[PDB]
Structure formats: structure tokens, C-alpha cells
Amino acid sequence: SQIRQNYSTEVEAAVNRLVNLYLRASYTYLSLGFYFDRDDVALEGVCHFFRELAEEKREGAERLLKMQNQRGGRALFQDLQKPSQDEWGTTLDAMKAAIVLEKSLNQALLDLHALGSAQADPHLADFLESHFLDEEVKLIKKMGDHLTNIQRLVGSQAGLGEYLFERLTLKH
Amino acid sequence: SQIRQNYSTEVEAAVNRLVNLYLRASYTYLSLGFYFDRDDVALEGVCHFFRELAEEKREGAERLLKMQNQRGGRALFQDLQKPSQDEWGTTLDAMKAAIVLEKSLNQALLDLHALGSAQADPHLADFLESHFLDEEVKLIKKMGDHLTNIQRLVGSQAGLGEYLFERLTLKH
Amino acid sequence: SQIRQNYSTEVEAAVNRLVNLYLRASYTYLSLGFYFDRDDVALEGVCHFFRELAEEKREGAERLLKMQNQRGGRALFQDLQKPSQDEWGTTLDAMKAAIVLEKSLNQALLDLHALGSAQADPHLADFLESHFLDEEVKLIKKMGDHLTNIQRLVGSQAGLGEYLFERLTLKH
């Protein structure tokens, strides 16, 4: 590289780690999506919701990789760990798992922002602020809204509630 | 005929039998459709679902008959047995009956494909692969998805669930 | 599942393995693409070529997963091994690696087709024939064409040849 300027080895490494976290999140959402497409689960609104998230997380990883090259850092890829479950339970279980996943991604963004700030790397800080921090806050708010609605629908007729949420809230 | 080539008498007969099975399936779906149009049943999404299937099965029979002539075989028609029931119960009962019917049609397709393969009749094999095997897999997946949704909706309020499935899943 | 018919546990497992191979290929192409976007490599036609392939391989994996559910099999995900190299050398080195990768995917498709045939699973066989086998042959032919052109351009002025191939053959 003959372009690198004000780009620490610490940030470079943390960016590579964050790419891995985003790709693993994308993989987790791929698994979630296809689980809800099983004939014995069959909630297509939920399938679509998670498949869209798999695409978003992949796009996030690609934006990070583009930035890594723009700064003169070098992409290094690691194994992608398989998702934490093979079967994901109810829509409620799945949405709970998704919120946990997003909170972990958000903390990783916040940690990287703090590192950039400590390293006086304003381009890195701006990059996260412009493309990641608000997208993450918006997504987590949506998931929280969903969780509340799913929970309200349980009552004593859980199957009915799960059907209605998929039909009337999720896009299909 | 002065066109027949590589077309066994065994395949010719099995094609005629398959036409009968498709026409009988069409007849079964005609009966299912009109049952759901009864004033004391009155589930128009279900009526439309089965009437559409009656049309599909008739079209399948006609494609087979066209192919029979293309190969130089001779169509032979047999009686069409009346459907197995006069009344079809709940949407759940009906969808269960439909899946049983489709699995039987699918096995007949698979048996004919195996016969064609044994007879080194690649045109027959390709014909089934191109126009029948995937259409059948897709349909059975849809029925399985429906069954799962219907079953989830039973709970302790079966009437409510039956109404909601017809309103919110089926086309009307 | 209440839809599974004529779908062996052997094929189900091999489909899961093939999904892993396609996702690993997609990952390899992601790494190839970003390597050619490095400021000290800077061959955008090559970047685009491999990024497009990453998308194609992901789409292939998703088609397999869709089919797995259509048949009533169950998706199981494994770790995605990181790509075999961190740096990919010249366009020639990269295209050689890509051909090796594609030949391995092609052999996996051929092995699965043979398994399906042995198991008298014509839907599986047709599925591969319709969506994978010719796409793979076409891609490998394109790569072979590229390799020949890259090799012709080496001469005694390798840098010049690498630039010209990227400018005049690859899309940019």
C-alpha cells in the first residue's frame, strides 16, 4: 500500500473481526430463514424477514471490506462458525435470538467506534456513524416492537397468535 | 401409426393408466371444490383452491394424451371412478385427503419414470421431468405448508381457525 | 415433515454437504474479489468478475436449500472454512485457482447426480441437470477461454498483458 494514512493496525484488525461477525450474522439469518420455510414450520413472513436480514448483514460485511481497502488495510478472512442452533423454535424464540445477535453486533460497532476515537481516526468513526450505528438502532427498535407484538399474541392460543403475527405484521 | 419409435407397449399402457389417474384426481377435486361451496360449509377460498387443482389435473391428463399421440401410442379410456367421499369434512380433513391423493399421483409418476428408464426411453423420462415431477413436488410442499398452518390454527377455537385460514391464506 | 417421498437420507446429507461447498466457494470468491480491489493490485475488471461469482455461488446454495425444504429434507449447516489463500497472486494465478475450485464443484455435482440416479430419485437428477450442470460447464468454458487469453498475453511484458486483459476482456 502507498495510500495508508492514520489507519492503525489495531483498527485494521478489529475491522477484519467485525467483517467476520457480520458474515456469521448473515449465516445465522440464512439458517433462520430456511427453518421457517420448513413444511412443518411454514411461516413465510418469518422466512422473508430473516432472509432479508441475511442480505443486510452480508452487505454490511461488504461495506466494511470496501472501507478496509479504501484505507489501505488488508482483508483477512477467518472461518465462519456455523449458527448456534440447527432448529429455532417459535417465532418468539427466533426473534429473541435475533435481538441477542443484534445487541452483540451493536456492541462490536460501539467498541470499534471507541477504538477509532481513541486512535484519533475520525474517518473510521464517521464511517460507522454514517452506515452502521443508526441502521442498528433502527433494526433493534423494530425487533423490540415485534417481540412486544408476538408476546401480546401468545395468550392461551399460541398457534393462533403465531399465525396472525405472520399474516398481519410481516410482509408476505 | 408410421411414427412410433422406441415406444414400448408397456409405457403406452402405463401412460393410459396415468391419464385415468389424473382424470380421477380432477374429478375428486371437482367434488372437493363444490363441497366447500355448500351454503352450510361456505369457505370460498377452499372452493377456489380445489377447483384450480381440478383444472391442473385435467391439463395434466391432456398433456399426457398429447404425448401419447406424439409418440404414436393409442389413447384408451376407462371409466372414471367417482371420488372416495361425498362429503369432505373440515378444511383439515380435505387437505389431508388432497395430500394422500397427490402422494399417490407422485408415486405413479415415479413408477412410470422408472419404467421409462428401464425401457431406455429418454423422451418419456424427460417428458415427466419437464412437466410433472417438479410441479408435483411444488404442489405437495404447498399442501404440507397449508396442513401445518391449518393444524396450528385449531387450538380450542376450531371454527375461528378455519375461518382465518380461508380468509388470510387462501386466495378469494 | 409430512411431504417427504422418494428422498433418501443419503441424498439429504449430500445436499447439505453441497450447500457447504457452494457457500465456501462463494466465500473464496469474496476473498478473490477484494484482493483485486487492493490499491497495490488494482484490477477492477478482475474484482468484478470474482464478486459476480461470489453472488452466483451464494445463489446456488440458496437454490439447494430451497430444494431441500421442497423435498422435506432438513438443512444442516456446518462451519465455512476460510479460503485457501489470503493473497491470490496474478490474474493468471487467480484464474487457475478458480478453475480448480470449479472442477471440484462440478465433480461434487456429478457425484450427487450419480447418487440420485442410484437411488432412483429423478427429481434430484432433473434438478441438477436443469439448474447446475450446464451452468457449471458454461462457467468452466469461460474460465478456460480466459486462461488461454491471459497466458497468450504474458510474453515478456507480463504487467502490460495483465492490464490489457483486464481492460479489454473483463467488464468494467
Next chain:
Amino acid sequence: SQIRQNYSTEVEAAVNRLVNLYLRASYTYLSLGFYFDRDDVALEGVCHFFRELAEEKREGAERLLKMQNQRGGRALFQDLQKPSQDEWGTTLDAMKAAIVLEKSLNQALLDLHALGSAQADPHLADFLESHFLDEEVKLIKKMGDHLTNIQRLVGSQAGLGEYLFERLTLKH
């Protein structure tokens, strides 16, 4: 002024200095552009590349001046030093000089951002982040990409390589 708020004399002075640096960069690019339009140089893609940069740097200076007035600071202009060379050598020499120039502008932006941060001037920090820091990173990446391509094309036929880069990479 009756509008000035949270705008230090230090930042005000540094903004004036940065305007001077941007105008001097614009002047340098004006000289570069016209050098490549000489009949004995005659590389119009290179002329256009540098003339466009002269416009960009002038626009940057004007944005800074607008901001200075928005904050209630007072523009102060100094002499514009003539560019460091009268003749700019090869496209390679020129692109090397341009990268050196851009790195100096980038460091000046980073220094000003640090000053704004130290002075708790978030409007100034945001201003640089929004209109300058990423534009600079993008430009330097482009120049690095160009340098790599120019360098690859030297080989033993430097004239040929210089022609081809101007024809096939630069806009004309």
C-alpha cells in the same frame, strides 16, 4: 458578528490556513493539467484528470469559506505560492506528486479535526467528516490504484505503457 458561538479563534485561523492549502492545491492541479496539454506531452486523459482536480480543490476552498462565514469567523487570504514544479515529468511522476499533495491535504484535515475535537466544536468536526474526510480517502485510493496501474505498464516499453494508461483508464 452577532452570530459567533462556540467558534474558537484557533479554529478560525486554521480554517483560513486550510483555505490557502486548498487554493494552492487547485493552482498546482491547474499547472499539472496544462502541462499535459503541451504539444510535446499531449496526454489529454491526464490533462482532464488534473483539471477536474483543480476544480474540486477550488470547490473545497469555497465550502470552507462559506462555513467560515456561517460560523461568524472572518476570511483572511494570503498569497498563493506558485506550484513546486514548472514541468511535471511523466504521468507516473505527476501521479506521485499528486499523492504527496493529497496526503498533505489529508493530514491538514486530520489536524483541523483534532483541533475541533479538542475545542469541543462538534459542528466543525461534523463539517469535515461530512464534506472532506471521505472525499479525500476516496481520492487517495483512486490515485493509489492509478499509480499501481501506471507502474505495471512501465516494463521495458514506457512510452507504450503511458499511452495505453491514458487511452484505456483515463476519461477522454
Next chain:
Amino acid sequence: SQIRQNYSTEVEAAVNRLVNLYLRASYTYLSLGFYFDRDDVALEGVCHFFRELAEEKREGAERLLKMQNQRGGRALFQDLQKPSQDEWGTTLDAMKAAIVLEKSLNQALLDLHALGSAQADPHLADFLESHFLDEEVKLIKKMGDHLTNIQRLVGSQAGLGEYLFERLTLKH
């Protein structure tokens, strides 16, 4: 026939021979075209150039056959000899072979024109003048132009020259 007038048996036979020569030329160009589509040759501009010529020569044969019937002569077909080579070497070798082939076709046209003139058959003479003689002169000029350009590009970097001619002269 009840239409034949002023149409000698000599011309009729020579027309049949010329049809054979045109069809053999078409066959030769078919072989040339597919040779350049080999993965180890891979010059698609050259493939397209010769495939287009195969079409032109077939069209020429068909025009001759139409004329034969218009005059009341009788088409007689002979074997089409396979092309003179199975592999065609470089673009230069191929273009040299093509020029040799075209000169032979041109001499056959000239010989037939002379025969028509000797037989006081102005319709035949006009037919060749209107549809063949200038088309042939134009084609040979194009081939000569190509040969000169190919030859100029050999230098000490033959592979590079062959690539550049295919990219920058031939349609692709």
C-alpha cells in the same frame, strides 16, 4: 423444363460445380469458426468472422441454385469434401488460408463469367456481375487489410499482437 432458353449444358454443369465450391467454402469456414472457439484458442472475434463467412458462402450457393432453376437447369449435388485442415494454426495462418480459398472462388467466378460470355449468355454474365464479382473483390480487400494488420502486430510479441487484433479490429 419448358422454360429453358439460351442456357447451355456447359454453363449448367459449371453452375453445379460452382455450387459445390461455395458449399465446400462454407464448410471450411464452419471448421475455421469452431476452431477459434476452442478453449485453447479462444479468439471469439475470429470465430465470429469465419462463422459469418460460412453463412455468406452458403447464401451464395443458394443464390446459384435459385438461378439454376430460374434458367431451367437442373441442380446436381456432389459430395462435399471435408476442409483441408483439422486445426488452423494462428489467426495469421487462418487468414492466409482464407485468402487462398477466396482467390480460388474468385477464379471460378471469373472462369464461369468467361464461359457465359463465350456462350453469349448475358443473363449469366449479369448474374455474376451483380451478385458475386464485387462481393468477392470487397471480401478479398478486407482479408488483405486484415493480413497486413495481423502481420504488423507480430513483432517480437506474437501473442499480444494476436489478442489485440481480435479485440480491436474484429467484431465481438
